[PDB]
Amino acid sequence: QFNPYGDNGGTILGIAGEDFAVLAGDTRNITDYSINSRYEPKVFDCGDNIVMSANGFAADGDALVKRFKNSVKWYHFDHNDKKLSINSAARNIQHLLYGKRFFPYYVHTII
Amino acid sequence: GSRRYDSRTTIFSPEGRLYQVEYALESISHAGTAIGIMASDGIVLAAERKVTSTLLEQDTSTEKLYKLNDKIAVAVAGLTADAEILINTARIHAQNYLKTYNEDIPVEILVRRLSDIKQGYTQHGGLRPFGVSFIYAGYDDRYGYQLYTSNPSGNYTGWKAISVGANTSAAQTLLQMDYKDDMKVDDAIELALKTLSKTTDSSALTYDRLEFATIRKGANDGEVYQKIFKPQEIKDILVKTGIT
Amino acid sequence: MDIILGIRVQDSVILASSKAVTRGISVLKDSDDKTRQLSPHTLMSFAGEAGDTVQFAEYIQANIQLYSIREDYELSPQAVSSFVRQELAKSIRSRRPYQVNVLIGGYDKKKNKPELYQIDYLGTKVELPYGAHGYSGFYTFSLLDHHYRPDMTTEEGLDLLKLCVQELEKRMPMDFKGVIVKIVDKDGIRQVDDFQAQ
Amino acid sequence: GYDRALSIFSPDGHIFQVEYALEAVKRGTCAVGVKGKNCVVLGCERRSTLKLQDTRITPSKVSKIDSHVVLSFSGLNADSRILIEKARVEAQSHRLTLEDPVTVEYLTRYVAGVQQRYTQSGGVRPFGVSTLIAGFDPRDDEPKLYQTEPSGIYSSWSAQTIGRNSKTVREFLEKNYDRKEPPATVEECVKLTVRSLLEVVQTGAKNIEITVVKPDSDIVALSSEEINQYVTQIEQEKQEQ
Amino acid sequence: AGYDRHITIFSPEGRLYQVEYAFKATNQTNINSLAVRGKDCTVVISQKKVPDKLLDPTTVSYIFCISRTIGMVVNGPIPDARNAALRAKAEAAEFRYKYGYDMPCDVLAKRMANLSQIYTQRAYMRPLGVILTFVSVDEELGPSIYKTDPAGYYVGYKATATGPKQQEITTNLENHFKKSKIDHINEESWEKVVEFAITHMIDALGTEFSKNDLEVGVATKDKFFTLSAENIEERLVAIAEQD
Amino acid sequence: MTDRYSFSLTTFSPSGKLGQIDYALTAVKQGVTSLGIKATNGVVIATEKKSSSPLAMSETLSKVSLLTPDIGAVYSGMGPDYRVLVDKSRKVAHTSYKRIYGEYPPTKLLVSEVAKIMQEATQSGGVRPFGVSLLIAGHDEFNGFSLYQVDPSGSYFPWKATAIGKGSVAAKTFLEKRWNDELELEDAIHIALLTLKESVEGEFNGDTIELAIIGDENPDLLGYTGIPTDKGPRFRKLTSQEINDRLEAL
Amino acid sequence: DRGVSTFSPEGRLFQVEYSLEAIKLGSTAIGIATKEGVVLGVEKRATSPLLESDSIEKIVEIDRHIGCAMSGLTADARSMIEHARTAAVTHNLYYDEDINVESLTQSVCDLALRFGEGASGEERLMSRPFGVALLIAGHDADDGYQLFHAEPSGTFYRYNAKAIGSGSEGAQAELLNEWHSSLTLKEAELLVLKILKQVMEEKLDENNAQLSCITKQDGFKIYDNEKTAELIKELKEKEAAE
Amino acid sequence: FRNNYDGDTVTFSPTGRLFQVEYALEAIKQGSVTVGLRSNTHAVLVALKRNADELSSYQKKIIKCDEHMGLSLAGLAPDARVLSNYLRQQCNYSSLVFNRKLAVERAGHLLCDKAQKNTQSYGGRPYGVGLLIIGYDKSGAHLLEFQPSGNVTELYGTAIGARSQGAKTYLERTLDTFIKIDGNPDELIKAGVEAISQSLRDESLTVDNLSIAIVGKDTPFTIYDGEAVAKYI
Amino acid sequence: GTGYDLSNSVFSPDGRNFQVEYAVKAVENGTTSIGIKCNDGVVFAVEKLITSKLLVPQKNVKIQVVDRHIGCVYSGLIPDGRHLVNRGREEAASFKKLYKTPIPIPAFADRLGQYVQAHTLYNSVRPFGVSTIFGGVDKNGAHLYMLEPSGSYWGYKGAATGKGRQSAKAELEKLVDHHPEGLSAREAVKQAAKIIYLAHEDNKEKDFELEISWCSLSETNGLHKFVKGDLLQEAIDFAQKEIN
Lengths: 111, 244, 198, 241, 243, 250, 242, 233, 244
Known about the structure:
The structure is cut from a larger assembly and holds 9 protein chains of 9 kinds.
Chain D: E1 9-10, E2 14-15, H1 16-26, E3 31-35, E4 40-45, E5 63-66, E6 69-75, H2 77-98, H3 104-118, E7 129-136, E8 143-148, E9 154-156, E10 159-162, H4 166-176, H5 186-201, E11 208-214, E12 218-221, H6 224-239
Antiparallel strand pairs in D: 1-2, 3-4, 3-10, 4-11, 5-6, 6-7, 7-8, 8-9, 11-12
Helix pairs in contact in D: 2-3, 4-5, 5-6
Chain H: H1 19-30, E1 34-38, E2 42-48, E3 62-66, E4 69-75, H2 77-98, H3 104-117, E5 129-137, E6 140-146, E7 152-154, E8 157-160, H4 165-178, H5 185-197, E9 210-216, E10 219-225
Chain I: H1 18-28, E1 33-38, E2 41-49, E3 64-66, E4 70-76, H2 78-99, H3 105-117, E5 130-138, E6 141-147, E7 153-155, E8 158-161, H4 165-178, H5 185-200, E9 208-216, E10 225-226, H6 230-242
Antiparallel strand pairs in I: 1-2, 1-8, 2-9, 3-4, 4-5, 5-6, 6-7, 9-10
Helix pairs in contact in I: 2-3, 4-5, 5-6
């Protein structure tokens, strides 16, 4: 049968400092035993001083990241250029994620 | 556009009246007179037929008295077709109540439901109302003998004796004259007939021009019997009364 | 399963229903009332799947209460039951059938006689001297088939229920935590506050 | 399909159909409700287009929405049926989900909103009805009287009336009801309600029907006679002079 | 009220004005057509009027090929005629698919009639200002001609004509038939029946024709076709050596 | 786009009349005469074939239609309106009856069905009443023979005999004298022929008269043999020849 | 007749203008916005002395940080407030923060022009414009205290102060004069109270005028009769001088 | 006359006019003034904002649609919202589905098609607002003018709103000059301001009064209001 | 009585559809554009009125392609025309998807006709305020077509519409009379430039921008392409020359 999911490996790590925070991730992308790419970034700058990575099934991670950046775009539009605080970005993501609770985004995300 | 040809059948006059309803009532007043008289051991429904001829077959005819279920019947005043539509649906709501609760439907519930269907055409949809008025004669374990009436405005009320159609004021006045709380079926029939006799827009009240019905709870039985009088029997009941 | 027994005496109907709600490895509550008053002379007892149970009960309650007000009248027990049956029989062919079993014990004020109806989640209805749902019936029906008499008093019926409960506490594997008894008669519905020790 | 805007604005800022619905209200029998110190009474006059009625069956003017709330109206009888049923259901629904019967206010706000809604939805004409809804909030003893109109507006009253000649009887209430001492008893409240009704009902025992609502689901309709007693004693608080 | 002359509702005399006007519309084009049945064919002639020199004369026709067997000629404006053509094609196809045989002329006619009847009864549908003459050599009935109008009427004819000078042609035609006493041109080749067709349209319209003034369509067993200017001319010649 | 005509096109006038309905009755009045006489052992319905040109082919137009094998209908008013009513009436006889009870519907019920449709055209949003009146004649094992008339309002009534359209009144009057309850079909046919003659302005023969009957069972018209319950259709359309033979006995 | 979304030859939507008229007959509502809060005061306007004045809701809370006063056919405002509330709560749910007042306001005005009879633009399911106008006042961290006037046309403006209802032109004019950057919450309460007094037919007292304010510290507070009465008294004295 | 054929957008007058659309166009002429003008490297929008009282805000007339597009409105604001929102969505779709910045020319084509539906459909209503659209894309700077009739035109510059004709003529002369203001943002703005001043009468353009927007080569569509337009008077 | 012109689907007593005809007027009040069919293709050209110098030159294109082998030009309410092209496009695609081969011109035309004719069938829509000249090259020849608001269309040797319509057709009639042989697409391009130029005289007030486009079996491969540069000037020149 068609299996809508896959695993593209990778690993990401995030650390919050006093006046900074980092979000690191490896750059390899695989499939089963083959290396798809030695350089395919998965940690992105989403504007408003917010970096995010959704690691797992790249298709899903990509879709997720796309939908969020866009959510940031519209937050500006609908709420007169206000900057999306991280706490707010978080909760927003909860909703993005939970919207697919019955056909999940097979990813573990961090911002 | 399309609005151009819309009559707005459910609007209010500056006087807070519903045109289409008022105008439907008027239509009804040109219809054959129907009467319902409630006794202490029965109910009589009698109606005067409109549109007659030497050739019209009265035997296999029923244009004014209809059976809704074994314990309830209605007399109609208005468009016979609009009538049948409401009847067929009332008959159904009766059977639904039955299936759902395994008890025959209380007369008033059936009535109220029908009145609610009419009130609809009064408040939404943009369609003409039904030019019909009903006199329901029915029996039930909670109130026994009942007589109600409904018209195009979807309003209903209960009666000891009543009439609908042409000459209501005349007939009503005659009924208020000779009716008394402790009447009896054989007497109400007479009254019913007399009343028709003096409101008829014709020469003489003949059998072929009548439809008669009674709902009696005979003592030697228990089940409420509904008897829709057959032509020969109208002729008979008519001679007895003396109209001949 | 939980226990739902009902026995129709001469002038009343007594429903007995277990006080326990267990989920998995723990008894969460020992005082549940697996019953809802449909109308002043009609009580319904229920048991089955976790949520469907109360949900179906309260829904039927609402509908019967509404009718009571719209007509300022109380539907006969027989009526209430036929209603319940049809709700069930319609449910059995829905996407997610209510998996609930009910006993309806009501006093018919018009006929002046107590009645008891047993209806299963499939909308299978029957009128009976005594009934039960679950495994309880497997013991009680024979017990009752033997000790039951049509002309018993409310008190005699209660004692009969007592026997039933005892047999059940003796032979059933689950500790159902006792029962709550309720009598439906001409003057209404009352709960026997004294059954844990009578 | 039928979605014609019937309630719409006219050059002066009026919604005719709404206003014309008020007229149908004025054309309906009077209804009064006055609240005492431990009760609320609702009286209504009786129609007269034809007579030889069966008093037993005909749907009276006061209806129970729930065991503790009543609603009387003035207007299109048929139109009122719809509001009642809709109100009753919500009365049940509210019980089912909040596990508490509605407050008179809630019930009022509900019925009210249904009316407003019909004044701005396509394909429908406003309700030709105004209502008096009274009773007591669950577990409270302070009487509640509210009134609603076809516009959808609502609010409460110490005493109030609607229907034909309500302008006349309102005056009687305005003069005879003191907010410092509302009819401190079921009796005097009934009386004051009858007195008021009399001023316009025009001496007719069988022309009046009164209902009293007390706390905790105690709602009682007076007998044709008990009222007649009120009419009698009342004609004396006018004759002894 | 006074709007009973905009939408298809009855007027106090019991008439549908919009239907009436629709009939007047059929004449807007000023073309006349006729159809006659041979012993085993059916011909319909319709004038062809190409005013403008800037048009491509071959794209002008009020004759349509509905199915391998049915031919239809319209008397009315083109946008309504084409709208009726398409549907008649859609319908004849659907019938073949669902019933396993070719839709006959009369049934196609009847079906086309019924839709018209509908515009006659529903406010939102304006009738089509066109008259449709369907012809074919039905496998069961023989040469056939069925015509329908905006009122929803349809019927079969021994021969027919339609257009501004309907009455003149009809009368000439009726006469020919009273003379013969039969119901069809007693001729073997469709070529000849086409001749009679033109011949009598001439005798009745009091006019002579050039090849680009006519449109001819024939229907034989298992086929309906429109004639070419040259086939038409072969005819025009044949008659101009008879008359 | 879309049928936004969702309101009634037939409403009530201040005099209580339903304009569109009265108007449809006028249209009926302008229509050719059609009648139906009921016998003790049959029923006949007939009408005139108003050949609208001698070029047209009369036979290719049935004004008299078989609804079921024991029921027929004829009309007066707007033919198209009729034709579509036959289609529907023929369909409903199946969908609301033969597909549920395995037997054809009885006259009054079928009539009842037809009538309901007509009523709808009197109240449904966006339509105009039908401009026809029909005479439906049939027979059914339990009611014997019948004859019904259905008006654009949707009202129907049974008749011993009647006529509708143009020469209605005169015809109604002619029937009232000739009719009686001991008429054998042949005699009613005859009477129908006479009655029809007086309305008919010009030619009168089997090529201009469409007369049909509902009588005895006709097995030769069944199309098959071997089943002793289906005895044959009772409706028969008279042939031109059969009409003439009775015409030549005026 | 003609449709409900028809443009006059002057380029305006009839039904909109007409509703704006109906709005002119409403009880006055005044709101003034200062660096210490926003006041919203309204005139109850009892149509009879038997009506229980406190049962007049013309100033509502949308959220702890947003309040609102209406003027016009007040029954039409119910669905608007609801939408306003849901809009704010929902925002808190999806973003864990307060909705900006502009944003809340803008959400309410999106309803405005959604009236029609099959207007090929979206699915406009409302038969006629709202016959009411709102004064929306609140506070957010980004743009401080704000007052907005929302009309049934879909437009809304921000005002340092504004009056709507019957006495609008007069009151507006007065406001215009009295208002200034460095006003104080109490001064504002007064002006509203004063200006209300002026345009009010009956004599302003605690049972017919209602005041309310919204401040960062305590949020939307509808002044209780006793507090307002004290202010009314504080006014008779301020006016009873010069 | 008129009174019979102006009832809706589905009726043509006997001259071939659409009055509802025409009436729509009038609300634009009633609106405040705004001007657009582009060089070969930037496109600016200067619009006069209009207050209601001396106690109110000056209605915002410019809206950013994407990082590369935006517009100034004249007329019925709601309709502006509805339309810009649509322009926002179509810009979003191009980015998301094609990773392509939407062509102003195409944005234009899309707006026209949207308005047109409300000018041939029953019960609907034309939009009542005109729009000046500017943007920088794969083919340089652009300025588009949109009218409720459905007509959209690309111009070197233009103006709309009350008294627009002043600036519209001004630019018509000033053309040869401004179209050459390449690589100098502030100047084009100035040119814009001058132009906008050609349609004034009321009072001189101030802080709360002015609204300017600029888009270009290395400049994302940015909105300048009040405190920041001071240097441009 | 009157009023037969307030609704789009209403037939007048003379059997005309007034709204369709008022539509035509909106057309006549518009720019001219023509189409000249030739020996193996068709050419289209339209006058483009220069409302102001503010207009950016050669940018507000008006001719439109459907698919890759069809040109469409119309005069009138521009948007109505665009609407008509969007459907054309959609209908072209639908045809290709199901049949693979690109839509034949006759077929394309009829698809257009039918959609336009449809806009004269209901009173909830107004007809189109444009006449469209379109055509291209297919499996068997070049095809030029013009469609009117009534949905009427036919095949043309040449065609024109808009204000300059008459002078245009005059010129066109000249061409058809003088060159019965046909015209090379090269020539037609010139001729079109002329006809437009002449036709501008019926509106000699405002200056204009010429716009041509062609589809030729040997010059553009059967694909629609616009005329730009070298080939454009040649025609503008040949035009300004014979204007005197």
